[PDB]
Amino acid sequence: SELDQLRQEAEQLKNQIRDARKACADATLSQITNNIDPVGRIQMRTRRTLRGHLAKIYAMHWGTDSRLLVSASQDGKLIIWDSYTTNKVHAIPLRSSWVMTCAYAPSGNYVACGGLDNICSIYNLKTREGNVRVSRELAGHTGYLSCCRFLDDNQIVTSSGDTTCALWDIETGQQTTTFTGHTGDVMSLSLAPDTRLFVSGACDASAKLWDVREGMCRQTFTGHESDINAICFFPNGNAFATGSDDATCRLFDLRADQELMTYSHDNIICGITSVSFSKSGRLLLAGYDDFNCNVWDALKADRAGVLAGHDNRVSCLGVTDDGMAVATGSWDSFLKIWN
Amino acid sequence: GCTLSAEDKAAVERSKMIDRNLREDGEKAAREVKLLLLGAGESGKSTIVKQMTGIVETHFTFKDLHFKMFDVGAQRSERKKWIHCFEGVTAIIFCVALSDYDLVLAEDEEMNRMHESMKLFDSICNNKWFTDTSIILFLNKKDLFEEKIKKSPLTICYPEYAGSNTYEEAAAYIQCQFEDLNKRKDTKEIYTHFTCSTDTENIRFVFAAVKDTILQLNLKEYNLV
């Protein structure tokens, strides 16, 4: 049978890939980073508390200038805050209140929203009338939208629940490229610092490295035992970290093309909703369903601190560009900034 | 206030106006009845709309209230990854057809749309997000059931079924079977209703169920329970 022959070929190729991956493993990160001094205890205190949302907060993104911030809640509101003074710069009402996404343009002129309506809405902030209009409404996905990650003022990526990713040209309003290959829902996105590649992590417990300019998968990383909800690049763009539903973070390496480190503890059993990296790449911050966040020494896997100030699940987590502060947003409609 | 420039007090003023508008909107939206419409492939989720992809929203007003109904039938994605978005809806309206006790689905083999509806109802009822949300169960398509139970008995829907072959007893058996699978009877109960083709009994029943649900949520905000 030709189908049987193709299945045997696929199995043989998977075995060859596994053997090649094994043959290039001589040591481990835990066996190499064994003589460096531990970071110690990372103690952080809340310095701002941004209130005003009246429902669960589902996403949040920092501004490139590290002062302005955007948050999306399920009461049908996108709020743009000035973190230094806690003032409400903007408040945008949404056509559909089922929103779990936020994106801030690198230039700062646009914001992007998406949710259960399968539509990516692009809002223009700098108008000649003092308003915030809906610049675009990109449609074409057949499942809910979960991450945007603006590229330029005219290019946007999208990850949706129909097991596909897309690259859209905003001006024309149509899909430029489509990335396929996942066998389950996709809830993640993270672009490389140079914005030529990106990674997605889906619900089939696998992550994929896509090339933006060619629309084809390069590498696939496995190892998790449940759905993946978070993903982020290492600052130098040569490794990434994933968070899933089995109470475990995992650091994978692009060049060696295999897993590097596992971050887990015995008395943690909940899921992980967010993942972010410190400015130097030494601290890994992960928000859990225990209503709090944990800090892991990225090179030794030892827990270095706990941020517990929320009365419900921690759903969004981010770090400023210059690494001054970390913002966490939870389902009690409160954002907190820790320094 | 004594260390702010002339352009910062105006920013504070704008923020305060934004806050006041947000509070007014939140006050307006806190007195809205929210219903989540659930069912099966074809059970009556369309015809129910006659009374008056992604989310589908319907708005209407019965006496003085603002009822909103959310329909999720085209959402073919994984239900576990978004069902928590509806934790807090006033009621869940579950539609079940009574003429699906002898019809197979496209899978053929051994399927019965009554049993699949039973599994979906059980999964929805025992969800961790809906441990205190009232469920209004509609049993649609009763006129055809009559006809079917005259010639075809309730033979292939429950192998252990025993008793007379009549509309009333069979309907009571189906209703009791559906009222089962709810292992929270202490702090939850279903609002069963055999739909009658009059277009006004259904809305009265929904209004009564919503009124009782609001009464039992106004006993917990005012420290009486």
């Epitope: 302005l68 003092g130 | 420039s5 352009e7 003023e13």
Partner: single-chain antibody, 232 residues
Framework: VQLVESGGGLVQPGGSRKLSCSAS????????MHWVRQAPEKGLEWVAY????????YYADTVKGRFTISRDDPKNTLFLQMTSLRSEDTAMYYC??????????????WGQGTTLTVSSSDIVMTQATSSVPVTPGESVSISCRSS???????????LYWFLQRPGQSPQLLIY???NLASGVPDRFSGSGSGTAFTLTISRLEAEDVGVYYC?????????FGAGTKLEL
Amino acid sequence: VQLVESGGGLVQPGGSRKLSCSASGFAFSSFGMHWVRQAPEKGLEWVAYISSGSGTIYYADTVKGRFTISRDDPKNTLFLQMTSLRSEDTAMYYCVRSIYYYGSSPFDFWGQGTTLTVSSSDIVMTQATSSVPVTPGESVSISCRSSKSLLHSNGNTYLYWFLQRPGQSPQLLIYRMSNLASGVPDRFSGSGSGTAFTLTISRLEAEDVGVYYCMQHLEYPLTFGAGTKLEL
């Protein structure tokens, strides 16, 4: 976007008058509004300000108790009611919009003018050079100077540069001493220190001839600077 003003005309010494701005093309309810008057052959002079939502109101020292500022958001109208007019109220009044938040550009759009003719401390900003002879294709420099220091503790230096062409409403060029208003060519540049500022026109043209004013936005009196006329 436009503001059209009605009223003006000839008045007797001692009386009443009313000026109105009708604004079309923008969200009038979100913009604070200023009335600014210019004498027949003198520089601009701030008159009155009303906030958004009418929460805050400010009047100049010269016109207080006899001038009133009012707003009508449903009808998109701004009123100024003047009573007991002296002979010093003969001027041309302009309607200005200003929106304040982090990163905004106040004073960006100046309406047209309406003329009133009656028939009969505060920061001081200095513009030393009253007139400057210039030729196209060269570089020019205009400098202002304030009695106090406009550098606040939050790092913002509040200084604005306006250009009034021969027979037109003033146009905003620089806001907060280093930023460029939208639609202004990149050859305009402004800088300076906490007390002495400057404006640089890299390559002059035939449309840059006019009068340049420096204004402060630290304390709400809003003093203006004298004129520095550029001529061919």
